RNA sequence: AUGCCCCGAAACCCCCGGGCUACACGCGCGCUACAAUGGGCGGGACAAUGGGUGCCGACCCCGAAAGGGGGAGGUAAUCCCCUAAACCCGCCCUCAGUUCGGAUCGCGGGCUGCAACUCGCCCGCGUGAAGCUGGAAUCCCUAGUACCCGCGCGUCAUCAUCGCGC
RNA sequence: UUAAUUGGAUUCAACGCCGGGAACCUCACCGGGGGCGACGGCAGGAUGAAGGCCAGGCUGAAGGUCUUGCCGGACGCGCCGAGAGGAGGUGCAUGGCCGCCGUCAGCUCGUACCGUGAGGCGUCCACUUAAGUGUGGUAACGAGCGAGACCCGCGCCCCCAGUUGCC
């Protein structure tokens, strides 16, 4: 089968189990209260997600 | 690519085709003649060919 | 709990908006809003060209609904387009207008003065543009144009002014455009008057 | 009786007081008692992150924050009012939940 | 995100085993000590921020300990994490490389995992290295601040001498 | 040192930094194995292409190949151009973001005057302020952004509220 040599594996833990919902990278991903984004994308989309910086 | 579809034992006046149908799917599709099992070729079957 | 509800239904809008930006790149997609009622939702898109967004008599919105319901949430959608609230006081439309004008072939100085004159005409207090790329050279540069009052730091220059950013791909490279417009009703704290007798 | 219990919760503070006073007035206009809006503790979600893409330069951080204001109302059940609080038409950034005891 | 130039049956896409954890050596930031302004054993006192439905586990019962078998209540000012440590009283030690210091190693019992040798973490008995206050030099701090003692989130299937808060 | 011990950062402003506490993945690194050319044309193709399997060898393990013969029903990297994809090169080709001079007190404009001109004056002097923050004199008279104002917490009092909080 030529569909058995370009197909991945279903991980369920470890850095390779989750990827950013908008960029697509593994690594530093935010998992607080559910949203799943980079540390880089959350910083330039937050003020539209509702957040604000008070201090 | 040649030509290979024959030897389905056959004469003039009557016919009794060599290999049986397939019990898995509908009739018409044949089986193997490997020599130890009727492998059924595609569906999987190892009745130790009769 | 309840926070997991609030910040799960705030992300869907982010994704829808960030996709429609690309998709309706032209016709100047202005922004949207989801109204969630029983038995289904209802989406609104303030385009700048109802014609292009609708399609050829309704042969695009079908694809928009199927795409917006198969890849996204929004189990029962109903789209309809509208016309912009104030296209000359919304920075994130002027940014794309100037970016388009640039990548069509105009020189980068005619575009900026066209835009600033139009904006300060339709009645803004102050505007500021800033272009920076590989224009006229092989070492990059940066230029600035502005007209009047415009606050830059503090709290008032975070909620009153309107700012937007865009890109403009070309044959050499990209070019960034960044606008910032002040609505005609500024009312900084310093503007104290005397209600007289 | 059976003392319905309604729980509003929203992120904009102003747009909550107006539905609160709607409920208060509706109750008042008809004949029914009520326990005024009892403020419950705010739940503020906080997210600390770095600031630079690369790793060079000093380390400076951000503090994003999201606050969620809650309330609680106790009221009796009269269909003249139990219905009157159905055409109330909450805004889109507010949550409401109704349940009796 | 992106222009130009190279790869283009490969420098693209998947799978198994190894490495980033190698060690004569120079350096940066820290943790534990060199004991009495203390070490051990038994009792007595008082917190705050935060988190939980792929998860937080009260209560009962097996085990010396790690842990194991059941299992209420919780989509939250309700149920749970959660009777903190430095502090005090009583007894042993009495200035010693010691009842200080616990590196380094042997054997046995467990948890997470599709997989613990290379290279995970935790428990019980045993062995007991350098270290007796630090040369020229150099760092941080102006008040509920410096110093001293513990706790919570993050990363996370397990593992905190770290970062950010109390 | 090694088959590989993947890279970036070197005074302040590189060294518990790249949220970098890596068993597989993360992974970019050494050993091995297998898949991938939308689209236009070429040898070929319903006398049957592309394309798929029970069992057995090779193999670390595998219909991945070969042995064995079964099936499927139209296309064709065996040939040419192109095209996906790229944690491959270049931060000295760019955008965005961020550190440092520095939360320092600076940076300019309109008109008028002084110089053939680059330029100057205002922005200088005197005292005062955390501050180009002020008060006086003056070929200058007025303005803009930064500073201050603005936003969030802490400490004291009063009114409205009383459940899941207190007694
Ligand atoms: Mg390393
Ligand atoms: Mg001891
Ligand atoms: Mg091991
Ligand atoms: Mg690896
Ligand atoms: Mg300077
Ligand atoms: Zn991302």
Say if strands C40-45 and C79-81 run parallel, antiparallel, or are unpaired. Answer: parallel
Q: Obtained via which technique?
A: cryo-EM
The answer to whether C2 faces chain D, any CB pair under 8 Å, is yes
Residue tagged 């193997």 (tokens): B32
- Do B and D count as touching (3 or more CB pairs closer than 8 A)? no
Q: Six-digit token pair at D58?
A: 């000093």
Residue A31 pairs with which residues in a beta bridge? Answer: none
Q: Which residue of D has its CA nearest to C4?
A: D45
Instruction: Tell me if residue A47 falls in helix, strand or coil.
Output: helix
Contact at 8 Å (CB) between D97 and D19? no
Contact C6 D92 (CB under 8 A): no
Helix (H, G, I), strand (E, B) or coil at C145: strand
DSSP type of residue C26: T
Q: How far is Cα C53 from Cα C45, in angstroms, rounded to an integer?
A: 9
From the list C169, C170, C125, C132, the residue with the least C-alpha distance to C148 is: C125
What six digits make up the tokens of C131?
């272009």
Q: How many CB atoms lie within 10 A of CB A46?
A: 19
Distance CA B35, CA A3 (A): 31
Look up residue A44 and give its two tokens: 């330039």
Q: How many residues does chain D have?
A: 101
Residues sharing a CB contact under 8 Å with residue C15, sequence separation 6 or more, in sequence order: A21, A22, C72
Q: β-pairing, C127-133 with C79-81?
A: unpaired
Q: Record the tokens describing residue C88, joined without a space.
A: 């000359």
Report in angstroms the alpha-carbon separations of D2 from B4, C30, D75.
85, 49, 9
Beta-bridge mates of residue C36 = C41
Q: How far apart are CA D4 and CA D82, in angstroms?
A: 9
The reply to whether CATH 3.30.70.600 applies to domain D1-101 is: yes
CA dihedral C151, C153, C155, C156 (to 10 degrees): 0
Contacts of D89 (CB under 8 A, 6+ apart): none
Q: To what resolution in angstroms was this structure determined?
A: 3.3
> A1-55: which CATH number, 1.10.340.30, 4.10.830.10, 3.40.50.720, 3.30.2130.10?
4.10.830.10
Burial of residue D34, with CB atoms counted within 10 A of its CB: 0-12 exposed, 13-18 middle, 19 or more buried: middle
- Dig out the tokens for C82 from the structure: 């509208």
Q: Where are the alpha helices (DSSP H) in chain D?
A: 14-29, 79-82
DSSP label at residue A33: G
Name which of C52, C58, C53, C47 is nearest C83 in CA terms: C47
Q: Which of C175, C168, C172 is nearest to C97 (CA)?
A: C168
Interface test with D, best of A25, A39, A50, A53 (most D CBs within 10 A): A50
Structure tokens at C174: 């990209």
CA count, 13 A, side-chain hemisphere, D84: 18
With beta carbons under 8 A apart, name residues in chain D contacting C3.
43, 45, 66, 68
The single-letter DSSP state of residue C72 is S
Q: Is the dihedral of CA C43, C49, C52, C57 positive or negative?
A: positive
Q: Please give the nucleotide, over all strands, whose C1' is closest to the CA of residue D65.
A: F152
Give the count of alpha carbons within 13 A of D8, CB side only: 28
Residues C182 and C124: beta-carbon distance below 8 Å: yes
Rounded Cα distance between A9 and A16, Å, is 10
Interatomic CA distance for residues C180 and C90, integer angstroms: 9
Nearest to C144, CA basis, from C132, C162, C161: C132
Q: What is the DSSP string of C35-65?
A: EEETTEEEEEE--S-HHHHH-SSSSSHHHHH
User: Where do the domains of chain A lie?
Assistant: 1-55
Interface test with C, best of A49, A53, A54 (most C CBs within 10 A): A49
> Rounded to the nearest whole angstrom, what is the distance from the C-alpha of residue C71 to the centroid of ligand 6?
18
- Beta bridge partners, C179, equal C129, C164
Helices vs. strands in chain A: H and E counts, helices first:
1, 1
Task: Enumerate long-range contacts of C63-67, CB under 8 Å, 24 or more apart.
Answer: none
> Using the CB atom, is residue C171 less than 7 Å from strand E?
yes
A residues 1-55 closer than 8 Å to D (CB): 30, 32-33, 39-40, 42-43, 46, 50-55
Give how far Cα D64 sits from Cα of A42, C197, D36, D48, D55, Å.
10, 47, 33, 7, 21
The answer to whether B46 and B35 are in contact (CB under 8 A) is no
Token pair for C132: 């920076």
Element (H, E) at D10: strand D9-10
Task: List CB contacts (< 8 A) between A22 and chain C.
Answer: 15, 18
Alpha-carbon span D69 to D72, nearest angstrom: 11
3-state secondary structure of C11: helix
């Amino acid at each position: 089968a030529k569909a058995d040599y370009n197909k991945r594996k279903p991980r369920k833990f470890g850095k390779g189990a989750r990827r950013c919902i908008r960029c697509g990278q593994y690594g530093p991903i935010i998992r607080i209260h559910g949203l799943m984004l980079c540390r880089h994308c959350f910083r330039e989309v937050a003020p539209k997600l509702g957040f604000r910086k008070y201090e | 690519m040649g030509q290979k579809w024959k030897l389905y034992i056959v004469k003039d006046g009557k016919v009794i085709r060599k290999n049986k149908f397939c019990p898995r799917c509908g009739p018409g599709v044949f089986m193997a003649d490997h020599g130890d099992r009727w492998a059924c070729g595609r569906c999987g079957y190892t009745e130790w060919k009769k | 709990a309840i926070e997991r509800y609030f910040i799960r239904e705030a992300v869907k809008e982010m994704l829808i908006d960030e996709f429609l930006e690309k998709e309706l790149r032209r016709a100047g997609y202005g922004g949207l809003d989801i109204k969630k009622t029983p038995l289904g939702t209802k989406v609104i898109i303030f385009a700048a060209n109802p014609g292009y967004v609708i399609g050829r008599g309704g042969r695009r919105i079908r694809e928009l609904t199927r795409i917006l319901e198969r890849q996204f949430g929004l189990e029962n959608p109903q789209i309809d387009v509208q016309e912009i609230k104030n296209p000359y006081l919304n920075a994130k439309v002027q940014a794309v207008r100037i970016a388009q004008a640039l990548e069509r072939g105009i020189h980068f100085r005619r575009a900026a003065y066209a835009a600033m004159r139009a904006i300060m005409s339709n009645g803004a207090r102050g505007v500021e543009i800033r272009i920076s790329g590989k224009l006229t050279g092989e070492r990059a540069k940066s230029v600035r144009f502005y007209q009047g009052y415009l606050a830059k730091v503090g709290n008032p220059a975070e909620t009153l002014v309107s700012k937007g950013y865009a890109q403009a791909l070309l044959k050499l490279g990209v070019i960034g455009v960044k606008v910032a417009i002040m609505p005609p009703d500024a009312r900084l704290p310093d503007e104290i008057e005397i209600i007289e007798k | 009786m059976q003392k319905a219990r309604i729980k509003l919760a929203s992120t904009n503070v102003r747009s909550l007081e107006e539905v609160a006073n709607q409920i208060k007035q509706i109750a008042e206009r008809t004949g029914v008692r009520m326990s005024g809006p009892i403020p419950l503790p705010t739940k503020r979600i906080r997210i600390v992150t770095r600031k630079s893409p690369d790793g060079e330069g000093s380390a400076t951080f951000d503090r994003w924050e999201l606050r969620i204001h809650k309330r609680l109302i106790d009221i009796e059940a009269d269909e003249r009012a139990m219905r009157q609080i159905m055409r109330i038409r909450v805004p889109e950034d507010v949550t409401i939940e109704i349940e009796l005891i």
